[PDB]
CSV table of C-alpha atoms in Angstrom, one decimal:
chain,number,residue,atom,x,y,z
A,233,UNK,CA,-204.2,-139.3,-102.3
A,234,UNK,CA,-201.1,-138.4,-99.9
A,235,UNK,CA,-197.6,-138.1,-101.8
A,236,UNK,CA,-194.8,-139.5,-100.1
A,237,UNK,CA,-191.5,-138.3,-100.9
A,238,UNK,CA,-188.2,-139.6,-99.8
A,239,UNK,CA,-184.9,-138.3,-100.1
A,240,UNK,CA,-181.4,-140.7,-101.2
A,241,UNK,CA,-178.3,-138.8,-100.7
A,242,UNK,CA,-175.2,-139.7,-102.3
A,243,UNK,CA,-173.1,-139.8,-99.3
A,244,UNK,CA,-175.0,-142.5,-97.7
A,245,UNK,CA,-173.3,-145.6,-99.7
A,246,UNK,CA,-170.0,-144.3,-98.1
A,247,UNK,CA,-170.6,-144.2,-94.6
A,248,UNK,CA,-168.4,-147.2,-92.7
A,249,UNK,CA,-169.4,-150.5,-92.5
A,250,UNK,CA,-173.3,-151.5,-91.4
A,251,UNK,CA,-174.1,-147.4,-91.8
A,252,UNK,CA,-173.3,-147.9,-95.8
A,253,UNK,CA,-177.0,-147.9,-97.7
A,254,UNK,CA,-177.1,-148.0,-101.7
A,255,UNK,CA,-180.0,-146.3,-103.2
A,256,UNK,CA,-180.5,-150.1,-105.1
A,257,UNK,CA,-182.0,-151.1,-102.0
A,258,UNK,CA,-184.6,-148.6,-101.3
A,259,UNK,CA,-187.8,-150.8,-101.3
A,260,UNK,CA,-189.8,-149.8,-105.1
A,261,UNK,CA,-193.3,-149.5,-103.4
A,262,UNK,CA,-191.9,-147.6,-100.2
A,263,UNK,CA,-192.6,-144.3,-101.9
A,264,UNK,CA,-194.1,-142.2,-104.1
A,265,UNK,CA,-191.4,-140.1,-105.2
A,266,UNK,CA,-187.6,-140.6,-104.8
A,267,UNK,CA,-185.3,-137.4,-104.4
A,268,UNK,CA,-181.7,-138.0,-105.3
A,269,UNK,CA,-179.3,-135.3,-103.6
A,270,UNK,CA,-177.6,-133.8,-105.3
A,271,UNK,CA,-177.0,-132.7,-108.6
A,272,UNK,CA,-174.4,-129.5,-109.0
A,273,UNK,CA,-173.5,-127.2,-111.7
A,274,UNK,CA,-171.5,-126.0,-114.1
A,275,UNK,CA,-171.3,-122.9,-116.3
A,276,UNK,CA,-175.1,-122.5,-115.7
A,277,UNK,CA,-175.7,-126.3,-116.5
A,278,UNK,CA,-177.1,-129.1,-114.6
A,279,UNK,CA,-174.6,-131.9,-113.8
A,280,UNK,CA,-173.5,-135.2,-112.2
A,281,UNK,CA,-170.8,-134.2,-110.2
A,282,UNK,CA,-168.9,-138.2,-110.1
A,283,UNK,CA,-169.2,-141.2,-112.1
A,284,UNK,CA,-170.6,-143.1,-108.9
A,285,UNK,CA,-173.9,-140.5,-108.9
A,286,UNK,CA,-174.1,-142.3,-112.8
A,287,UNK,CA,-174.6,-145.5,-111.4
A,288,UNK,CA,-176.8,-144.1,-108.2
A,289,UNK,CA,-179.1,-142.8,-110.9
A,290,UNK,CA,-179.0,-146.3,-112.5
A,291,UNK,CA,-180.4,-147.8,-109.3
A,292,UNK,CA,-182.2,-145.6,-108.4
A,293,UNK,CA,-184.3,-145.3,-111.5
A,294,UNK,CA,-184.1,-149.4,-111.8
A,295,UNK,CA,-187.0,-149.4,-108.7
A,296,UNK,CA,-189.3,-148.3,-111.6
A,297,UNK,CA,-189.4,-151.8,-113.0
A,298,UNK,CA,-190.7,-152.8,-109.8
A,299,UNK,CA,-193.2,-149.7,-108.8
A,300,UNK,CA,-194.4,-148.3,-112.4
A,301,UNK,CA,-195.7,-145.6,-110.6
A,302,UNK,CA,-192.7,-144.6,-108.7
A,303,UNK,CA,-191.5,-141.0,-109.9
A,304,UNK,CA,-187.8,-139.8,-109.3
A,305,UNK,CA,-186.5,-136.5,-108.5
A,306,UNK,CA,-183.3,-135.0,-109.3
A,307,UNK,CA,-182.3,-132.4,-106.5
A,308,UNK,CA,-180.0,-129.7,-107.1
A,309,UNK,CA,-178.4,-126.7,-104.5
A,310,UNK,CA,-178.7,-127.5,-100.7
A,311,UNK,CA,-177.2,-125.7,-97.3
A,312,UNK,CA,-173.5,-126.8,-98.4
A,313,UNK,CA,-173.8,-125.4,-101.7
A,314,UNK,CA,-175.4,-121.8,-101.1
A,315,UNK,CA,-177.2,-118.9,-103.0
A,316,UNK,CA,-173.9,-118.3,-105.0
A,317,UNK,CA,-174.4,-120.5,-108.3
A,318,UNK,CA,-178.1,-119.6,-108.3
A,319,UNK,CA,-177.5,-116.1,-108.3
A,320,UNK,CA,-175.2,-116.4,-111.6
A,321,UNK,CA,-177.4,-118.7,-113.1
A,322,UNK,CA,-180.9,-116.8,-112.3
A,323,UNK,CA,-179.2,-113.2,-113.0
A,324,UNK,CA,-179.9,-113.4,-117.1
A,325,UNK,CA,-182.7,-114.5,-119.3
A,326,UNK,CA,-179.5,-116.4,-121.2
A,327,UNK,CA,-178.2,-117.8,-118.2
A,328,UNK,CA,-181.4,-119.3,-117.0
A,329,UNK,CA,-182.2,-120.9,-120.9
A,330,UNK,CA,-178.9,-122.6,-120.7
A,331,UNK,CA,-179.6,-123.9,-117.4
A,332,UNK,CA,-183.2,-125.0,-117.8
A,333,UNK,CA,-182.5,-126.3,-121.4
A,334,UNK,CA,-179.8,-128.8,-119.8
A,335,UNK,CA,-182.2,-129.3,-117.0
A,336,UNK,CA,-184.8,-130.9,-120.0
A,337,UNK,CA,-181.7,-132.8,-121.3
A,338,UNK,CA,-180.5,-134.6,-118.3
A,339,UNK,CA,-183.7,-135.5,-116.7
A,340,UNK,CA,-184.8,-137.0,-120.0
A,341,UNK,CA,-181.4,-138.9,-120.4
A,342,UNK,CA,-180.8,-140.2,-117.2
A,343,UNK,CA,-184.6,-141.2,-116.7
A,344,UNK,CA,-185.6,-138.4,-114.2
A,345,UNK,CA,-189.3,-137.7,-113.7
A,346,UNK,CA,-188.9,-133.9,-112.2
A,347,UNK,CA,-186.1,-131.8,-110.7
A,348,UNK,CA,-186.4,-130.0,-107.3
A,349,UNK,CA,-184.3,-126.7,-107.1
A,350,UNK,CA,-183.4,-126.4,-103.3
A,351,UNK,CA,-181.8,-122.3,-103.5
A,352,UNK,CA,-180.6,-122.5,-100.1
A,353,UNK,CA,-181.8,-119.1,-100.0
A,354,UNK,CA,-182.8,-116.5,-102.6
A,355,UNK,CA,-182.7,-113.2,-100.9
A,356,UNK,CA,-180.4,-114.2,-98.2
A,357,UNK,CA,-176.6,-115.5,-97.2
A,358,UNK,CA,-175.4,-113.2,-99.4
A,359,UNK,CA,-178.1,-113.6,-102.1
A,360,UNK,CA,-179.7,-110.1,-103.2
A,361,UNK,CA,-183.1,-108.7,-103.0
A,362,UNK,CA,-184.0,-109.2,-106.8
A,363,UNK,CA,-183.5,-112.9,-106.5
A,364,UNK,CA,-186.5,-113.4,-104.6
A,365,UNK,CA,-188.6,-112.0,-108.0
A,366,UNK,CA,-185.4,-114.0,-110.6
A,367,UNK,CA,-185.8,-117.3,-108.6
A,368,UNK,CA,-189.8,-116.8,-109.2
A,369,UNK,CA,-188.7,-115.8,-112.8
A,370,UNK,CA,-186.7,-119.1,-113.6
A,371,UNK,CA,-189.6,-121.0,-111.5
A,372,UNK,CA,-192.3,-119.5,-114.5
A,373,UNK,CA,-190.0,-120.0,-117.0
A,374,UNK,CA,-188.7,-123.5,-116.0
A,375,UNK,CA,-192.5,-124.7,-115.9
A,376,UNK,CA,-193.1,-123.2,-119.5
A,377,UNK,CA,-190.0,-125.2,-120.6
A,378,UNK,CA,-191.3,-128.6,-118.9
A,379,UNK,CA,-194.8,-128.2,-120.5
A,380,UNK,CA,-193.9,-126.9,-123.8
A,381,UNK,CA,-191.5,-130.2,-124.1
A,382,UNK,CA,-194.3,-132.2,-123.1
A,383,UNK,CA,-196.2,-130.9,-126.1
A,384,UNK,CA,-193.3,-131.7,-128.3
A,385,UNK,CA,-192.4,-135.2,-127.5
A,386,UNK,CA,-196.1,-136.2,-126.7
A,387,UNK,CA,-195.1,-137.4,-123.0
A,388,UNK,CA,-195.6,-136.7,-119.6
A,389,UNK,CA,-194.3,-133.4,-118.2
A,390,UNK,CA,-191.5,-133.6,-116.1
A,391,UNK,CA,-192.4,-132.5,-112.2
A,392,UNK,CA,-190.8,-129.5,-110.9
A,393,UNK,CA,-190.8,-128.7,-107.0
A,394,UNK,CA,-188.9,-126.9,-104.8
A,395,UNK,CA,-187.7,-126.6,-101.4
A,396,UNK,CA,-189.3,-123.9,-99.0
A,397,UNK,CA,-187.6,-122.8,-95.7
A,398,UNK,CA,-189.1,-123.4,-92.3
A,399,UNK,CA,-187.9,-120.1,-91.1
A,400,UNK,CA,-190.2,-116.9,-91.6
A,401,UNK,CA,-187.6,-114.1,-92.0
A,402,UNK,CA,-186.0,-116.5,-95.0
A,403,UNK,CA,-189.7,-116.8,-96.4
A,404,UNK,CA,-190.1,-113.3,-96.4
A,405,UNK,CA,-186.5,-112.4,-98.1
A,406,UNK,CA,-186.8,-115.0,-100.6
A,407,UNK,CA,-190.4,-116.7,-102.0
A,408,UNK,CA,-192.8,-114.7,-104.0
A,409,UNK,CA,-195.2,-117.8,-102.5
A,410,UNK,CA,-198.9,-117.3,-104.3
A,411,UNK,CA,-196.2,-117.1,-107.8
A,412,UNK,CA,-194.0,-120.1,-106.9
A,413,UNK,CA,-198.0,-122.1,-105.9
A,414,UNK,CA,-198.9,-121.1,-109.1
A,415,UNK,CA,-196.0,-122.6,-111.0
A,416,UNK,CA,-194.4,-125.9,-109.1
A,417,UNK,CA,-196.1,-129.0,-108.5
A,418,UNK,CA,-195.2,-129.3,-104.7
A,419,UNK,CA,-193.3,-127.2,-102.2
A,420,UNK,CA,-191.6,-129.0,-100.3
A,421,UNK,CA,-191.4,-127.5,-96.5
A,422,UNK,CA,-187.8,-127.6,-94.7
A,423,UNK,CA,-189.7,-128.0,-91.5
A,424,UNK,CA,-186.7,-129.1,-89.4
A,425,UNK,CA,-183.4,-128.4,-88.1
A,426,UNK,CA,-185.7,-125.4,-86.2
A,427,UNK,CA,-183.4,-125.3,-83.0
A,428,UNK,CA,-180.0,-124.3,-83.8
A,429,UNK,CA,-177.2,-125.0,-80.6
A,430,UNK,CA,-176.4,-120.9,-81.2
A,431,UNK,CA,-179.2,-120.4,-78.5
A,432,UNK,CA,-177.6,-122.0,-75.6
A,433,UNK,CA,-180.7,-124.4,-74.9
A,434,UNK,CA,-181.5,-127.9,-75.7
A,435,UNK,CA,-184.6,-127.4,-78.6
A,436,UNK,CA,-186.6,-129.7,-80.5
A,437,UNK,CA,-185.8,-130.7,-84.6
A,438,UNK,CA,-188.9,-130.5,-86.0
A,439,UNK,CA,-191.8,-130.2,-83.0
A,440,UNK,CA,-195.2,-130.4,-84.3
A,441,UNK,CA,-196.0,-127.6,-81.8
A,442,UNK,CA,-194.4,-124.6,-80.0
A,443,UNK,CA,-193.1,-125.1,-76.4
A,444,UNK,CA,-194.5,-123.3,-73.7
A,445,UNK,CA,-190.9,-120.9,-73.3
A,446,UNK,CA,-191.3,-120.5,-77.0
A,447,UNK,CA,-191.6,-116.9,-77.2
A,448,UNK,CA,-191.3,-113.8,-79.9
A,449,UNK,CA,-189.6,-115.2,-83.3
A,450,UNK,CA,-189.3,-118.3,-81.1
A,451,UNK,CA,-193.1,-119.2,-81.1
A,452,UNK,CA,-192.7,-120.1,-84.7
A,453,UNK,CA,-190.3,-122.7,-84.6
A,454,UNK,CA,-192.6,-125.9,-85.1
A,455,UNK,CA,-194.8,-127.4,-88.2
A,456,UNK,CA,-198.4,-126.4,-87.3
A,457,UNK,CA,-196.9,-122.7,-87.3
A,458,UNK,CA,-195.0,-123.0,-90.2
A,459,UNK,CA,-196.9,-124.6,-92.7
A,460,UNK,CA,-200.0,-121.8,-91.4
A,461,UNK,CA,-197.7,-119.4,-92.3
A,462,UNK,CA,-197.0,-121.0,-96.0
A,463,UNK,CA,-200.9,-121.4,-96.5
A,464,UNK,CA,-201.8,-118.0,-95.0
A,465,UNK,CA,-199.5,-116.3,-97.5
A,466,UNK,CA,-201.4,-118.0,-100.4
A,467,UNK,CA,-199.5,-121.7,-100.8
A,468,UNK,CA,-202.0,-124.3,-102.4
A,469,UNK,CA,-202.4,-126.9,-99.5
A,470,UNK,CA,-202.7,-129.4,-101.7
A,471,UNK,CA,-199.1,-128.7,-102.8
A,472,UNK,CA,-197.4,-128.4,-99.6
A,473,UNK,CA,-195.5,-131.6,-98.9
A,474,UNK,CA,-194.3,-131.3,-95.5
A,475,UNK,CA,-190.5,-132.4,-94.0
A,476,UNK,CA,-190.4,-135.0,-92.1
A,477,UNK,CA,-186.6,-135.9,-90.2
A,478,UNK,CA,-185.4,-139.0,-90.0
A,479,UNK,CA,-182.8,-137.4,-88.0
A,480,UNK,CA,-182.6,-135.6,-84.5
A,481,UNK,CA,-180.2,-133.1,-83.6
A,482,UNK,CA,-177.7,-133.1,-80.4
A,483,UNK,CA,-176.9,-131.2,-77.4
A,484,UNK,CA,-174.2,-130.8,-74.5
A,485,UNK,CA,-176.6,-130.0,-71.4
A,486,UNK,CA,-174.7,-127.7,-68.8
A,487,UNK,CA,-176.1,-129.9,-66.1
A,488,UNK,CA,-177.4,-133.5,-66.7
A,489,UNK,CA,-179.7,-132.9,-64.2
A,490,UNK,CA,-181.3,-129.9,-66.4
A,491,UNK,CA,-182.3,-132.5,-69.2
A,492,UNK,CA,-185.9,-130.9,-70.4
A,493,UNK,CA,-186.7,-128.8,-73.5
A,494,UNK,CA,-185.4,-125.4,-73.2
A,495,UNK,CA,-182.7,-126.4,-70.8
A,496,UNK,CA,-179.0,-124.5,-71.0
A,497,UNK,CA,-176.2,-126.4,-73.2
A,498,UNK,CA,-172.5,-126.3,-73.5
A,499,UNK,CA,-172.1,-127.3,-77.7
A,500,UNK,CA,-173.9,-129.5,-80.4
A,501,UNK,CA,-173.4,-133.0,-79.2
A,502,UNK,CA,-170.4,-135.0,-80.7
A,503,UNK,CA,-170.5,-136.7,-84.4
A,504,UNK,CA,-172.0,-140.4,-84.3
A,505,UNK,CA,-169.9,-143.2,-85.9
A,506,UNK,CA,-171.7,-143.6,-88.5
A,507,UNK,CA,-173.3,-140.2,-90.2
A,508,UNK,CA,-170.4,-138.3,-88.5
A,509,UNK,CA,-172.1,-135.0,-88.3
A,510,UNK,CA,-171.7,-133.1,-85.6
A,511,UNK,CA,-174.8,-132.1,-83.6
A,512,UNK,CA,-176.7,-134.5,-85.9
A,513,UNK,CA,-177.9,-138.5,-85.1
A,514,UNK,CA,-179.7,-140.5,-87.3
A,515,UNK,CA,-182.9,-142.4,-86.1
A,516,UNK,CA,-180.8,-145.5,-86.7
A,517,UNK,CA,-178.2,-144.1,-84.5
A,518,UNK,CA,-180.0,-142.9,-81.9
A,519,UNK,CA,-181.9,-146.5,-81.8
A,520,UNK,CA,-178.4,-147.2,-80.4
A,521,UNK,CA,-178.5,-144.4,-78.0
A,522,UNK,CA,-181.8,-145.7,-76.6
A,523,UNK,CA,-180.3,-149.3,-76.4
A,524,UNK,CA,-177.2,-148.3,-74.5
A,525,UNK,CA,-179.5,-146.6,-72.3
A,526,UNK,CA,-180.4,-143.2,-73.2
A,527,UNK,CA,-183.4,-142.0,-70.9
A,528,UNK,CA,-186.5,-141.4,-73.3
A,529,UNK,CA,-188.9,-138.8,-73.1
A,530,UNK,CA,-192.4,-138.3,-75.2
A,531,UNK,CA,-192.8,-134.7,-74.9
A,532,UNK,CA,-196.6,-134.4,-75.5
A,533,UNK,CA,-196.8,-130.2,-75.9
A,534,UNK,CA,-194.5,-130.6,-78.9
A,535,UNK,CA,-195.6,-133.8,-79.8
A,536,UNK,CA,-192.1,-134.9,-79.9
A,537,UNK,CA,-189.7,-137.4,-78.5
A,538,UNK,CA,-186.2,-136.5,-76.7
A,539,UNK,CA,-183.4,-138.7,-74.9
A,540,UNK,CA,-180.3,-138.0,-73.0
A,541,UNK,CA,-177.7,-139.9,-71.4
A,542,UNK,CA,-175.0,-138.5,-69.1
A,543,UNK,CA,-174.7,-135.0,-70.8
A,544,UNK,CA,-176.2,-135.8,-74.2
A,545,UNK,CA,-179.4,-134.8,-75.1
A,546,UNK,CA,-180.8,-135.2,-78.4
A,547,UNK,CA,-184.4,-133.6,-79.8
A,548,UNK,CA,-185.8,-135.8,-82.9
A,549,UNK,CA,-188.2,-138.2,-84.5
A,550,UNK,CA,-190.2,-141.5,-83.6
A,551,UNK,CA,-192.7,-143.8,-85.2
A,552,UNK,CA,-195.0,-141.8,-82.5
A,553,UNK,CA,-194.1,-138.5,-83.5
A,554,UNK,CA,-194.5,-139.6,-87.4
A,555,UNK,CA,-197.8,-141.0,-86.1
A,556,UNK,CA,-199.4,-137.8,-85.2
A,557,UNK,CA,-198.2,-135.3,-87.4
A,558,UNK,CA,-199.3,-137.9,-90.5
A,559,UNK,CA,-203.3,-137.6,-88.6
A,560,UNK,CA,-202.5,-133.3,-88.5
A,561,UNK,CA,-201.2,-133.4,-92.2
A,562,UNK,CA,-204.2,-135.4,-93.2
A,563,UNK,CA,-206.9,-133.2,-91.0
A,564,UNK,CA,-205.1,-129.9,-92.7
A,565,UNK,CA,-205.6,-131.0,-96.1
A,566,UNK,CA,-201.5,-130.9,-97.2
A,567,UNK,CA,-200.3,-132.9,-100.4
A,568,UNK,CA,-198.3,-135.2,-98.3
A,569,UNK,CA,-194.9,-135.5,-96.4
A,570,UNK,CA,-191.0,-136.2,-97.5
A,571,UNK,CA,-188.6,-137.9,-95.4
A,572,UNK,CA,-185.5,-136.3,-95.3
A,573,UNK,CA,-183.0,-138.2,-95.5
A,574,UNK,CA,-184.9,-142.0,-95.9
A,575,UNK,CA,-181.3,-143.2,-95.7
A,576,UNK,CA,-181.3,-142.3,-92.1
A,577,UNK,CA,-184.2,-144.0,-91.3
A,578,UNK,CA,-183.2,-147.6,-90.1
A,579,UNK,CA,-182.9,-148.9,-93.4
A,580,UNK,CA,-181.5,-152.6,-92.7
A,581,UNK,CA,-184.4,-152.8,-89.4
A,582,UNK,CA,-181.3,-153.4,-87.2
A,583,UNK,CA,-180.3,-151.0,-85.1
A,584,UNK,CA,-183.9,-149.9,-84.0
A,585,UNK,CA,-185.7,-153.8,-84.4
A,586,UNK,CA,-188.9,-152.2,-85.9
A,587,UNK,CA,-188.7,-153.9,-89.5
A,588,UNK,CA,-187.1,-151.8,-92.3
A,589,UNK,CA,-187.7,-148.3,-92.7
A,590,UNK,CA,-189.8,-148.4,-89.7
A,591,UNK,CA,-190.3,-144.3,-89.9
A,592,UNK,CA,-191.2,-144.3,-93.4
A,593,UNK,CA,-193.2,-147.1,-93.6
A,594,UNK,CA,-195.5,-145.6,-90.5
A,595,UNK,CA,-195.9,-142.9,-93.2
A,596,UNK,CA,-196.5,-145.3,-96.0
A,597,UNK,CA,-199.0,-147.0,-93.8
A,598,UNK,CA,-201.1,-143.9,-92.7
A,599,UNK,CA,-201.1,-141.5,-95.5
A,600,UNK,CA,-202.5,-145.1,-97.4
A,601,UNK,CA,-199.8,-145.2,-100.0
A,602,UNK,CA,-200.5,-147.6,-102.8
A,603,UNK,CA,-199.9,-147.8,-106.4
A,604,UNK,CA,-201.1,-150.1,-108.8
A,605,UNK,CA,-197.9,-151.7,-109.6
A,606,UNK,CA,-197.2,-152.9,-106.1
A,607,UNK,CA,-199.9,-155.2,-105.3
């Protein structure tokens, strides 16, 4: 079958008022996997980083008395935390035993099925050449860990993944890829935030396909390119799980009557009340943007929706846009998909009035998502 993968962040609970979702309340049968961000660090060890993540990973690991087949994911790194603590921890064969023999220890304690690294990058912001080969290194030797301790204690192995970026210089400074196939269980594709505001043109989060102003480096930027690039570079389809937004990212347009793709901009768009991010809206959120009026657009070449009001403009995700690139997943063979974050979806159904978790659950409903636990 199709894996689907779905990301809890710890922030979410603390968001004000009806934004607030606890990871207790992620539907059990929903998923496949559950990813909790994030994990941190310390002196080359995994850890919790507050008491509250103690009783996340409680709930969270709780849904498995509902879905039996339900598998949960500890994440550790990120954008926020960068390349630093990954360089330390990667630079010695001791460095990495301490980290991956703590990894074994807390997954196990705190009921974890797997761990994804998410190096946000080897190789670049700072990170050196060698840890493209080290990060492939601890990626062997983490996998040789996980299976000889499933040996030992005559259980399952723990899953590891990782994150892969969506960009192809960062691919190139940073993922030994047919190495990294051989070793994870799933890579799982950053294939969003692809149009930065830096440009100085409204651009698409995550478009299936390029635009037709798309050019040079530029021609890259969307999920059919991407994930060819992965496979043609020697990924296992099979293991690719590719990123799904439940997110869209804003825009200032220079002149509201210059509302397309590819059309000049001022700034990132303004933080929304509830994720208060700037440049960033959740689906949820921008359900609210749509009510209060936001012309919407179905942008067929990219296969993606976009909707602006006054001058805001914001590129992102719909049930639609989930739609088709679920049918294009399935008709290029990939392992499956991960919604990043779930809790921007519209977890409560009501901001957007499509039931709950109306993006996931088109995913759920197309890549036939089942489990025997849940019926």
């Amino acid at each position: 079958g199709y894996q689907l993968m779905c990301y809890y962040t710890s922030w979410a609970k603390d968001r004000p008022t009806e934004g607030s979702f606890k990871p207790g309340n992620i539907d059990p049968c929903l998923c496949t996997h559950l990813i909790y961000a994030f994990a941190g660090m310390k002196n080359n060890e995994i850890t919790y980083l507050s008491e509250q993540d103690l009783r996340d990973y409680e709930a969270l690991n709780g849904l498995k008395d509902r879905n039996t087949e339900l598998k949960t994911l500890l994440a550790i790194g990120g954008w926020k935390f960068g390349p630093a603590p990954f360089s330390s921890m990667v630079s010695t064969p001791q460095n990495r035993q301490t980290f991956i023999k703590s990894v074994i220890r807390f997954l196990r304690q705190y009921n974890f099925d797997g761990l994804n690294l998410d190096w946000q990058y080897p190789g670049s912001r700072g990170s050196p050449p060698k840890d493209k080969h080290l990060f492939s290194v601890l990626v062997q030797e983490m996998r040789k860990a996980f299976e000889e301790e499933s040996t030992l204690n005559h259980i399952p192995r723990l899953l590891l993944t990782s994150t892969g970026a969506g960009f192809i210089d960062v691919i190139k400074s940073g993922y030994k890829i047919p190495e990294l196939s051989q070793s994870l269980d799933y890579i799982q594709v950053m294939t969003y935030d692809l149009h930065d505001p830096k440009n100085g043109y409204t651009g698409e989060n995550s478009p299936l396909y390029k635009s037709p102003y798309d050019i040079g480096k530029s021609a890259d930027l969307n999920v059919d390119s991407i994930i060819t690039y992965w496979k043609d570079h020697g990924a296992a389809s099979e293991k690719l799980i590719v990123g799904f937004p439940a997110y869209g990212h804003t825009f200032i347009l220079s002149d509201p009557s210059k509302n397309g793709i590819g059309d000049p901009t001022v700034s990132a768009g303004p933080p929304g009340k509830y994720t208060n991010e700037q440049g960033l809206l959740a689906y949820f959120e921008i359900c609210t943007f749509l009510n209060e009026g936001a012309t919407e657009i179905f942008d067929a070449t990219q296969e993606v929706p976009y909707a602006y009001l006054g001058n805001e403009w914001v590129g992102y995700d719909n049930v639609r846009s989930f739609k088709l690139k679920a049918q294009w997943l399935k008709d290029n063979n990939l392992g499956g998909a991960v919604v990043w974050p779930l809790d921007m979806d519209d977890f409560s159904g009501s901001f957007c009035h499509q039931g709950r978790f109306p993006l996931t659950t088109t995913l759920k409903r197309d890549l036939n998502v089942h489990s025997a636990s849940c019926k």
